[PDB]
Amino acid sequence: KKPELLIFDVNETLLDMGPLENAINESLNSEHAFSLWFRTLLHYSLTETLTGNYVDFGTIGKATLKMTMRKFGKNLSEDRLDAILGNIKKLPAHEDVKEGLKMLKEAQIKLVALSNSNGKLLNAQLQFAGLADYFDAIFSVEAVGRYKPELASYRAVLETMKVPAENTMMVAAHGWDILGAKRAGLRTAFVAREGHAIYPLDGTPELEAKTVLEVARTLLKN
Amino acid sequence: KPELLIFDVNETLLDMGPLENAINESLNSEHAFSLWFRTLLHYSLTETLTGNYVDFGTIGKATLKMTMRKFGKNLSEDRLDAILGNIKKLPAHEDVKEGLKMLKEAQIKLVALSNSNGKLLNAQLQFAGLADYFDAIFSVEAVGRYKPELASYRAVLETMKVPAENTMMVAAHGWDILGAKRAGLRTAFVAREGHAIYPLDGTPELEAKTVLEVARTLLKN
């Protein structure tokens, strides 16, 4: 019943996106801008893979912020866009994360991170948040050139760690990440960070919790 | 000069107003429709990338429930059905019919291609009075792969027996422009309010504000 391996999504699951959310919403003068931008980023990332291409996630992020800014009547300069997006490198951990990761690491469950962010950005993010040392390995989808939730993204991690899908649990605050992990055969835990929903069409996880700490306590109980 | 024009349907041809109004009024926000529809599109590509094909309207219902929750609301299942029923009650944009008439008079073949299932798509185009303008009406349901997957455009090309390079995709969605381009098609972006070209190699061959203006640009000597 204990997983051999936990794979953690990073954005929102571990990292509080507030600094970036606030910067986008302030610049576009709407509390609704961040959510529409990030969904557009995710949408175009999957558009890229389905049309046979891989582009750095942050480059899609900037491109789709330029598209979204226009929907809000703004036309931001290159310097303004870069300043907004620079907050992606300065995201603190959610307050529950470190204690959850600590107890999972003490229980000798292998812990890895998997993000659509490129490897250099992902490592800088986890260093800034003080989380990098909890992980046995830190993975960007950049290496295989296929974004989550494509099955190949999870599979690249399983093959590198040499752990079967069914001995692995994906921990994520994104319903689509839950869905992809499930369909690759992984166990799943949904972290119900504010503003995120489970996908109703067969997206139910094994575990649901409000925090990573609560996931950890459930796994380690008994 | 294209042999074949493929038209996207939602927004490109159809005024989404009735559906936009139903979602925004029901969730009490002018921002609900844009977030819902982007979430729909995102999950449609999630479905195909995690190895699955699901009726587009069924994804629509599921992502509308998610969007309802993001706005903190508790609407009934029947209310979600009532909202989504407006997808079949969308009028054509006022420019569309004259544009389609002018292109067919120029002896260009005209077809529609939508992620909507075939029965829903027919119902939409009948309500809008557009169905009869088309030489063929295509749903991705037939191939089980959504736009912008290569298979979606290719099914049209193979049925119409027209090569990609003699076919132009007309769409108000930057991701549809990009899919068509990478399938080898020519492209025309219809710059309807609230839609942008994708900056990363998404530039179309032609751009205009309406379907009539695409027609006038295409046929200009």
Query: Contact at 8 Å (CB) between B120 and B86?
Result: no
The strand ranges marked E within chain A are: 5-8, 110-115, 137-140, 168-172, 187-191, 207-209
Tokens 């899609």, residue?
A60
Please judge whether A200 and B69 are an interchain contact, meaning their C-beta atoms are less than 8 angstroms apart: no
Method: X-ray
B residues 195..214 contacting A (CB < 8 A): 196-200
Q: Residue B184 region, left (φ>0) first, then alpha (ψ -120 to 50), else beta?
A: left
Cα dist. B136→A17, B14, B89, B160, B219 in Å?
Answer: 46, 17, 21, 9, 22
C-alpha to C-alpha distances, A57 to A172, B31, B40, B189, B195, nearest whole angstrom? 18, 25, 20, 24, 21
Q: Are B147 and B179 in contact (CB under 8 A)?
A: yes
C-alpha–C-alpha distance, residues B96 and B134, integer Å: 12
Cβ neighbors of A134 (< 8 A, separation 6 or more) are A98, A101, A102, A105, A111
Helix (H, G, I), strand (E, B) or coil at A187: strand
Residue A188 burial by CB count (10 A; 0-12/13-18/19+): exposed, middle or buried? Answer: buried
Instruction: Using CB atoms, pick whichever of B35, B59, B148 lies closest to residue A39.
Output: B35
Q: How is chain A split into domains, by residue range?
A: 1-16+90-222, 17-89
Contact residues, chain A, for B39 at CB < 8 Å: 39
Under DSSP, is residue B161 helix (H, G, I), strand (E, B) or coil? coil
By the CB < 8 Å criterion, does B107 face chain A? no
Taking the Cβ of residue B85 and every Cβ of chain A, the question of whether any pair is shorter than 8 Å is answered with: no
3-state secondary structure of B51: coil
Distance CA B181, CA B140 (A): 18
Say yes or no: A29 contacts chain B, CB-CB below 8 A: no
Is the minimum CB–CB distance between A186 and chain B shorter than 8 Å?
no
Chain A contact present for B75, CB below 8 A: no
Instruction: Name the residue among B34, B20, B4 with its Cα closest to residue B107.
Output: B4
Contact B167, B3 (CB under 8 A): yes
**B126 vs B26: CA distance, rounded Å:** 26
Check if B40 contacts A (Cβ < 8 Å). Answer: no
To one decimal, the resolution in angstroms is 1.8
Question: Number of C-alpha atoms within 13 angstroms, CB side, residue B95?
Answer: 15
B46/A149 Cβ within 8 A:
yes
Q: Which residues contact B203 (CB under 8 A, 6 or more apart)?
A: B197
